[PDB]
């Protein structure tokens, strides 16, 4: 719609603000991966649980390289 395109503007801004926050803290992730984690957090999630996954899945894919 139009008010549904105003919401897509409202999220493309936020995903970009969190990317500037992503690079000043030097995370290994980029805009696509970051776009998943906001959707998880909207439902409510444990970031103590999420961070242990990401340090594992990024650590165990250079054995398939």
């Amino acid at each position: 719609a139009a008010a549904a395109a105003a919401n897509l503007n409202a999220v493309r801004e936020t995903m970009d603000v969190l990317l500037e926050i992503s690079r000043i803290l030097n995370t290994g992730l980029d805009m696509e991966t970051l776009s998943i984690c906001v959707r998880l957090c909207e439902q409510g999630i444990n970031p103590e649980a999420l961070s242990s996954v990401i340090k594992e899945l990024r650590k165990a894919t250079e054995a398939l390289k």
Partner: protein, 57 residues
């Protein structure tokens, strides 16, 4: 009997070591107050045997 000597001593030792680590732990959680531990092993022998096993999340 060593079912009346050594077994009882080991049972007491289990319970006593458990209570001793409990007491040292219950001071270490908050933060001289640490001087009670510092005196008791002045050599630093058994200075800390719990390395704090981890938990999920």
């Amino acid at each position: 009997l060593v079912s009346g000597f050594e077994a009882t001593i080991n049972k007491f030792d289990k319970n006593f070591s458990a209570h001793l680590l409990d007491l040292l732990a219950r001071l270490s959680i908050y933060s001289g107050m640490a001087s009670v531990i510092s005196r008791l092993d002045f050599n630093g022998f058994y200075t800390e045997r719990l390395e704090r096993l981890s938990a999920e999340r």
